[PDB]
C-alpha cells in the first residue's frame, strides 16, 4: 500500500482524535513546500527572460526566491485558519494572525534556508517548528517563546537533487519523497533512526582560529585518530538543511559552535536549531550547544541564536565529553 | 531577445560553417541532460512504490539512477550519428559505435557525478568532454587518449536546487538555466569569467594526515592568514560538479591532490579533470596538478586518475608558488 | 484566500462531523485523478520509444491507457481503507475489497471515459459516484444497486486542454482546476448553477434513422425554430465527460436516447448516467430518460444501461413535453 | 533509434542543404508550441488565485490565454531571425519584422484556434503556414498573399488529452507527440496517409436551414444511405484543429461550407484553410471549397474567409460529384 503525506497526516490525526485543525495546518504546509520547490527549480523562468516579450507586468514586478518563499508560507499558513502566531526569519517581529483566520497553533519557520548557496544552485530548503498556544492571553510573541521540548511537530523540506520532506512528531520521524510528476509526497522511510556512530564530520573550518579548545581537540581527533583508525571524511555544503539531512541518513556529526563573529553561535534557535534538534532526538540522535540540550533552552528573543552540535549519539557524546573534560 | 541552448548551438554551428554534425551532437547532449534531470528529480517515483499496483519488485531489481543515466547518455549520443568512440566512467572499455551510426566525434563523460551524495539527495551532475576524431585508422580507445588541450567542447549539467548546463567552447563559457516548465535551457550568463581571487577554499580536510607539505601549508594560510587578513571560508559539497560550479560563480579554489591511498589523486583525467580544467581556463581560471597544466597531460589509460587544483588565477598561483617553494 | 481541493474536502468533512473515512476516500480519488491526468498527457512516453535504449523491462511490460487508469483507481481507492465494494466499467463483476482494507463506501466509476477519442487525442475523463453501504449483510454487488438519489458524492475529472475536477455533494457543485506545476486542484467555481436555458444541442445525429418521433421533432425544432429565432448551435465531442461539462458551463442540452443497437440506450446507469445526473440536478439542471428521472431508477444490473437527456431546465422540459405529447 | 522533432528538423535541413535559416524557424516554432501548451494546461494558475498573496487583480486584468499565445508566437518567431512578415488572426494588419531581425520567411498562423471551446476546456490548438519570400521589394502584406500551393511547410499543434504537433512539408506529414516530462516532441508516426474512405462526417448541423442543396443531400446520404449500408457516425468538437486531426487519423470528412450569415464560409484562408488543406493533400486527402482546390485560391485579403471540405479522398469526391450534380 502506497502512502502519500496527505494520507499519513490525516490518519495520524484520526489516531489522535484531533478536531482536524492541525491536519488542515500540516496539509497547508505540504502545499506550501510544493510551491516553493517548483519555484526553486526555476519553472517559468523563461518568462523572466522575455519568451513572450515584455507586456505582462504593467509595472516592475519581480521577486527574489527567498522573498517569494516567505510570501508562500505566510499566505498558505494563514489560509489554513489554524494559526495565531507566525515567526519568520524574514520578519523582525512576530506575525499575529487576524481573528477571522486565527487558530491555536504557533509556527516558527525559515522559508528558504542556505541563502549563500542560492546563486550557486547548491541545495537549499525550508525549516519549520510547530507549537500549540499555551495560554489564554491575547496572542503575541511570547506564545512563540517556548522551549523546543514543547514542539508538537517539526521538520524540513530539502530542495536537492530531488525534493524531500522530513516530518517529526511524538511517535517518530518519517521521510517523504516528492514525485513532481503528480505533485505527491510519497512515504519512503518510516520510523527513521540515525546510526549510533558515523564517519563524517561537518563544520566550516574557516573559523578554525576562533574555535574553542574542545572543538579544536575534536576536529584533530577526527583527522588523526588516537586508535589509529580511518579518519572521518569531511563534508560541509553550507546549507544547514542539506548538511543536517545527510547527517540523519548517513550518520556522523554536524557542528556550528560560537566564534568571534558569533559568541552565541550563528544559527537561530526558534526556526533552525530547535526543529533540527527535535528531528535528531526523535531519530535517537542528540543535539547540544556543548553545555546543554538545545530543546531545553527557554528562549527570550524570537530571533535569538544558539550554538549547535547534533547527529549520531556516540559522536556527539564524544565531543560532549571533551567539553566536560576541559571544564 | 531570449536565447535558448537550441538556438545558441544552431547559430554557433552556422558561424563555424560546420556541416551540422557537431550541432546534432550537442542537440542530443541537451536532450540527454533533460531526461537525466527528470529522473534525478524523481518524477514517477510513485509508480515504483505501487501507485498503480504490481508491488513486488520493491527492493533492488530496477535500474539505479546512475545506471539509467548512463543508458540515456549512451543511447542518446549514439542516436545523434555524430560519434565513433565513447568513454564512460561506468564502462571498463571504450564504446566503439556501430559503422551505421558512426560519426567523427569522441565523447568522454561521467553520466552521474557525485555518487556518494546520491542517497542523501545532495547536488549531483553530468560531466562531458568532446574530441574530434583525427587519425584515419579504425576507431579505438586510443582516439579518446588525447590531451585536454585538443578538446572541441566540454562542460557539465548541475542537478542542484535548479538544473543548469555549462558549456565551454573555443570562444567562451556560457551558462544555461533549464526551465522544466517547457523543457528549455535558457541562456542566463554569456561569456563567463571567474574572478581573479576568491575567499573560499574547497577540499576534504579528512585526508589531512595524508596531505603533502604544500597543500598543508596552503590550508594553514587560509585559516591563519600570516598578514592577518580575513580567513577564507570553507566549503566541500562532495560532488565535484557542485564544488566546481560554485568555484566558477563565486570564485575561490577547489582541490583534490594526491593522498597516500590515492598517490595519483582520485579524480579521473578523461571525464572529470580535463572537462573542468577546460571550463576553468576558458573562464580565465587555472587547473593544475600542482606541477603541470591538467590539459597538457598525455593520457595513457581512459580511466587514469590525476591530481587537480582549479579556480581563481591568483589563488591557484599562490599554491603553485608554494609547490615550487618546496622545491 | 486560495482554496485547494484538499482544504475543501477536509473542511466539508469537519462541518459534517464525519469520522474522516469519506475524507480519506475523497483525498484518494484526488490523488488517483492526478496520476491518470499525468499519464493521459503522455509524460515519459519517450521511454516507450527507447530514449534510454531497451533494457528496463526484463520482459514485455506495456499498458494501454485505459487499463492503467483502471489499475490506478482500484489500487488508490483500496489503499484508502474506506471502501467495501467497487464497480468498474472494466470489470464484469463487482470488486469486493478484502476485510483488512474494508470501509463503508461503495464506489462506481468509469476509469477512462471516451475510449473512441483516445487515439485521436480528443478530451477524455474519469467519472465516479459514491454511496454509503446500506446494509449489515456481507458486502456484495447488491450494495452497488442503489438508485442515484442515494449518492453521497459524485462527479468527474475532465482531461481536456486543461484538467478539471468537478465535485458534487448535498450542498452543491464545485469545480477545481488542476495546476500541474504544483499538483494541486484549485477551487475556481463555487456553488455552480447551470443556465435555465441554453443555445446548444449535443447528440450523435448518425443514428437519425433510429430516433423516436420525440427526439426527431425536437432536433427539427432546434434547426428550424417555430418562433423564428436563431437555431441552436450543434456540438458533439464523442466523449460524455466533455459534452456534459460544456453543457454545465455553457448550458444547453445533451442527449443519448435509445436506438436499434441500443433499445435501452448505450450509456451505463451506475457509472455514467447517475453521476452526471446528480451533478446536473445539484446545479439546478434536469436528467431524464425521457420517461423518468435517471436518479430514481432502481438498478438490477451493475452494468445496466439507460437512455439519458440532461442539461438546462427549460431545454430538457421542452423535450419532456414532446414526449408527454406523443404519449 | 528514437527521433525527436529537433533531430528530425535538423536532418531535413541537412538533406535539403538549407543554409540553416528554415531550421532555426522550425526550432523556434517548436519552442513556442511548448510554451503555449504549458499555459493552456494551466501551470501556475495557483498564483493567479493568490497562492503567494497579492490578491487584487482577480477579475479581468491579466492576459487572456489567446493573447498570451499570440505574444509567444510573435516574440519567439521574431527571435528566430528567419522571418520578415507575419500574419496573425489576432492582428488586423500584417506584422513587418524589423530589418535587424528580418529573414526570408512569411508565417501565417492562428495562435489559439477553437476560441469557443476555451472556457469549457475542450481541445484547442495552434495552426501555421510558412512561405518563402519571393519578391525583392520591401516586405509587405502582399508577401503573405500567395496561394497555399506555394507553402514550404504547414501544420498544427493540438492541445488535447495530450499535445501533438503535426508537420507537413514537401515529402510528407509526420506526427510528433510532446513528452511534457522532458519538453521533447517524439516522432510517433512518420509518412502519414489518410484512409481512402471513412465512416464519420463532421459539420455543425445547426446551420441546416442555411445549407446549400449539395451539403443537404450529402448529409442525407450519411444518415439515410440509399444503398442501405451503415450510416456514418457524427462528430463535431467545435475546434477545427481537433476535428481535422481526428479526420487525418480516423479518416472521414470535415465540412464548413458557406451559410447565409457566412456567404464565403467562416474559416480563414491564410491561417486555417490553407494549412489544413496542405496537410490533407500531403496525406493523400482532398481539400475543396466545393468547386475549387483550396490551395489554388489566390488570396486578396490576409483575413479572407473561404468554404472548406476536407478529408478522405472518396468521401470528398462524393460530395464534389453532388456539387457538379446540381450543375
Ligand atoms: N495530523 C495529526 N498528526 C499528529 N498529531 C495530531 C494530528 N492532528 C492532531 N494531532 C494531535 O492532537 C492535538 C489536537 O489536534 P487539533 O484538535 O486538530 O488541534 C494536536 O495538538 C496533536 O497533538
Ligand atoms: N554548433 C557548433 N558550435 C560550435 N562549433 C561548431 C558547431 N558546429 C560545428 N562547429 C565547429 O566546426 C567543426 C566541424 O563541425 P562539423 O562539420 O559539424 O563536424 C567542429 O569541430 C567545431 O569546431
Ligand atoms: N469530506 C466530506 N465532505 C462532505 N460530507 C462529508 C465528508 N466527510 C463526511 N461527510 C458526511 O458525513 C458522513 C459520515 O462520514 P464518515 O464518518 O467519514 O464515513 C458521510 O457519509 C457524509 O454524508
Ligand atoms: N529543416 C528543414 N527541413 C526541410 N526543408 C528545409 C529545411 N531547411 C531548409 N529546407 C529547405 O531548403 C530551403 C532553403 O532553406 P534556408 O537556406 O534555411 O532558407 C527551404 O525553403 C526548404 O525548402
Ligand atoms: O558561512 P557559514 O558561517 O558556514 O554559515 C553557513 C550557515 O548559515 C546558514 O546559511 C544560515 O541559515 C545555514 O544554512 C548554514 O549552516
Ligand atoms: O569522499 P571524497 O574522497 O572527498 O570524494 C569526493 C569526490 O568523489 C566524487 O564523487 C567522484 O566522482 C567527486 O564527485 C567528488 O569530488
Ligand atoms: O459513438 P457514439 O454512439 O455517439 O458513443 C459515444 C459515447 O460513448 C461513450 O464513449 C461511452 O462511454 C461516451 O463517452 C460517449 O458519449
Ligand atoms: O460555432 P461554429 O460556427 O461551428 O464555429 C466552429 C469553428 O470556429 C472556430 O473556432 C474558428 O476558429 C474553428 O476552430 C471551428 O471550426
Ligand atoms: Mg537559515
Ligand atoms: Mg564523478
Ligand atoms: Mg464511458
Ligand atoms: Mg481558428
DSSP one-letter code for A85: E
Pairing of strands A153-159, A163-169: antiparallel
Q: Are B299 and B266 in contact (CB under 8 A)?
A: no
Cβ contacts of C301 within 8 Å, gap of 6 or more? none
DSSP-assigned beta bridge partners for residue A162? none
Whether D184 has a binding-site annotation, put simply, is no
Segment (H or E) for B34? helix B21-40
3-state secondary structure of D277: helix
Phi–psi pair at D236, nearest 5 degrees: -150, 95
**Which residue of chain C comes nearest to A183, CA vs CA?**
C183
Cα–Cα distances in angstroms (integers) from residue C195 to residues C281, C285, D259, in the given order: 12, 8, 28
Cβ contacts of C115 within 8 Å, gap of 6 or more? C66, C124
Strand ordering across the sheet containing C233-234:
C233-234, C200-202, C253-256, C308-311, C286-288
Cell numbers describing residue C117 = 477519442
Name the closest-CA residue to atom 12, ligand 2.
B18
C209 interfaces chain D, CB cutoff of 8 Å: yes
Of D237, D263, D241, D305, nearest to D89 by C-alpha is: D305
Phi–psi pair at C225, nearest 5 degrees: -55, 125
Cell numbers describing residue D114 = 477553437
The experimental technique behind this entry is X-ray
Cα–Cα distances in angstroms (integers) from residue A227 to residues A213, A234, D240, in the given order: 20, 19, 79
Angle at D201 (CA atoms; ends D197, D206), nearest 5 degrees = 165
> Which of D179, D204, D245 is closest, CB to CB, to C45?
D179
Q: Does residue D16 line the site of ligand 4, with CB under 6 A?
A: yes
Select from B161, B209, B220, B255 the residue whose CB has the most chain A CBs within 10 Å, as the one to mutate to test that interface. B161
Quote the CA–CA distance of A122 and A126 in Å, as a whole number.
14
Chains that touch A (3 or more CB pairs under 8 A): B, C, D
**Which residue of chain B comes nearest to D14, CA vs CA?**
B20
3-state secondary structure of D144: helix
- What's the length of chain B? 327
Chains that touch C (3 or more CB pairs under 8 A): A, B, D
Angle at A290 (CA atoms; ends A286, A294), nearest 5 degrees = 55
Quote the CA–CA distance of D319 and A54 in Å, as a whole number.
49
Residue C315 burial (CB count, 10 A): 30
User: CB within 6 Å of ligand 8 — which residues?
Assistant: C 233; D 113-116, 204, 238-240, 266
Name the closest-CA residue to atom 13, ligand 2.
B18
Q: How is chain B split into domains, by residue range?
A: 1-191, 192-326
Q: Are C36 and C28 in contact (CB under 8 A)?
A: no
Of A201, A203, A76, A196, nearest to A128 by C-alpha is: A76
Q: Which burial class, exposed, middle or buried, applies to C204 when counting CB atoms under 10 A from its CB (0-12, 13-18, 19+)?
A: middle
Task: Judge whether D89 counts as a catalytic residue.
Answer: yes
Sign of CA dihedral B190, B195, B199, B204: positive
Question: CATH class for domain C1-191?
Answer: alpha beta
Sign of CA dihedral A268, A271, A275, A276: negative
For A:28-47, CB contacts with D below 8 A are 35, 43-44, 46
Quote the CA–CA distance of B18 and B5 in Å, as a whole number.
17
Angle at D184 (CA atoms; ends D18, C239), nearest 5 degrees = 120
Q: Which burial class, exposed, middle or buried, applies to A327 when counting CB atoms under 10 A from its CB (0-12, 13-18, 19+)?
A: exposed
Instruction: Collect all residues of chain B within an 8 Å Cβ-Cβ radius of residue A221.
Output: none
Quote the CA–CA distance of B287 and B283 in Å, as a whole number.
11
3-state secondary structure of D39: helix
Of D193, D127, D179, nearest to D3 by C-alpha is: D179
Specify the ligand 4 atom closest to the Cα of D23. Answer: 1
Of B291, B325, B324, nearest to B309 by C-alpha is: B291
Instruction: Collect all residues of chain B within an 8 Å Cβ-Cβ radius of residue A207.
Output: 231
- What's the length of chain A? 327
Cα–Cα distances in angstroms (integers) from residue B245 to residues B155, B222, B267, in the given order: 10, 20, 16
Q: Are C235 and C227 in contact (CB under 8 A)?
A: no
Residue C26 burial (CB count, 10 A): 23
CATH of segment(s) A192-326:
3.40.190.80
3-state secondary structure of C205: helix
Quote the CA–CA distance of A166 and A154 in Å, as a whole number.
9
Q: Are B205 and B21 in contact (CB under 8 A)?
A: no
Q: Does residue A238 line the site of ligand 5, with CB under 6 A?
A: yes
Q: Which burial class, exposed, middle or buried, applies to D67 when counting CB atoms under 10 A from its CB (0-12, 13-18, 19+)?
A: middle
Amino acid at each position: 500500500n502506497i502512502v502519500t503525506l496527505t494520507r499519513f497526516v490525516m490518519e495520524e490525526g484520526r489516531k489522535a482524535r484531533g478536531t482536524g485543525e492541525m491536519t488542515q495546518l500540516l496539509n497547508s504546509l505540504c502545499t506550501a513546500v510544493k510551491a516553493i520547490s517548483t519555484a526553486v527549480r526555476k519553472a517559468g523562468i523563461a518568462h523572466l527572460y522575455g519568451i513572450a516579450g515584455s507586456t505582462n507586468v504593467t509595472g516592475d514586478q519581480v521577486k527574489k526566491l527567498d522573498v517569494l518563499s516567505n510570501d508562500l508560507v505566510i499566505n498558505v499558513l494563514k489560509s489554513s485558519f489554524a494559526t495565531c502566531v507566525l515567526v519568520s526569519e524574514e520578519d523582525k517581529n512576530a506575525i499575529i494572525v487576524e481573528p477571522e483566520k486565527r487558530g491555536k497553533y504557533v509556527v516558527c519557520f525559515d522559508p528558504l534556508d542556505g541563502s549563500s548557496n542560492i546563486d550557486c544552485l547548491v541545495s537549499i530548503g525550508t525549516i519549520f517548528g510547530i507549537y500549540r498556544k499555551n495560554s489564554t492571553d491575547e496572542p503575541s510573541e511570547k506564545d512563540a517563546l517556548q522551549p523546543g521540548r514543547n514542539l508538537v511537530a517539526a521538520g524540513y523540506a530539502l530542495y536537492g537533487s530531488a525534493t524531500m520532506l522530513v516530518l517529526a512528531m511524538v511517535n517518530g520521524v518519517n521521510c517523504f519523497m516528492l514525485d513532481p510528476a503528480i505533485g505527491e509526497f510519497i512515504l519512503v522511510d518510516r520510523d527513521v533512526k540515525i546510526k549510533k556512530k558515523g564517519s563524517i564530520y561537518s563544520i566550516n573550518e574557516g573559523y578554525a582560529k576562533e574555535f574553542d579548545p574542545a572543538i579544536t581537540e575534536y576536529i584533530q581527533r577526527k583527522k588523526f585518530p588516537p586508535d589509529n583508525s580511518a579518519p572521518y571524511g569531511a563534508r560541509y555544503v553550507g546549507s544547514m538543511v542539506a548538511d543536517v539531512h545527510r547527517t540523519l541518513v548517513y550518520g556522523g556529526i554536524f557542528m556550528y559552535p560560537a566564534n568571534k563573529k558569533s559568541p552565541k553561535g550563528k544559527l537561530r534557535l526558534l526556526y533552525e536549531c530547535n526543529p533540527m534538534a527535535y528531528v535528531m532526538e526523535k531519530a535517537g540522535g542528540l543535539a547540544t550547544t556543548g553545555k546543554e540540550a538545545v530543546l531545553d533552552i527557554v528562549p527570550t528573543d524570537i530571533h535569538q541564536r544558539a550554538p549547535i552540535i547534533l547527529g549520531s549519539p556516540e559522536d556527539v557524546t564524544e565531543l560532549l565529553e571533551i567539553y566536560q573534560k576541559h571544564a
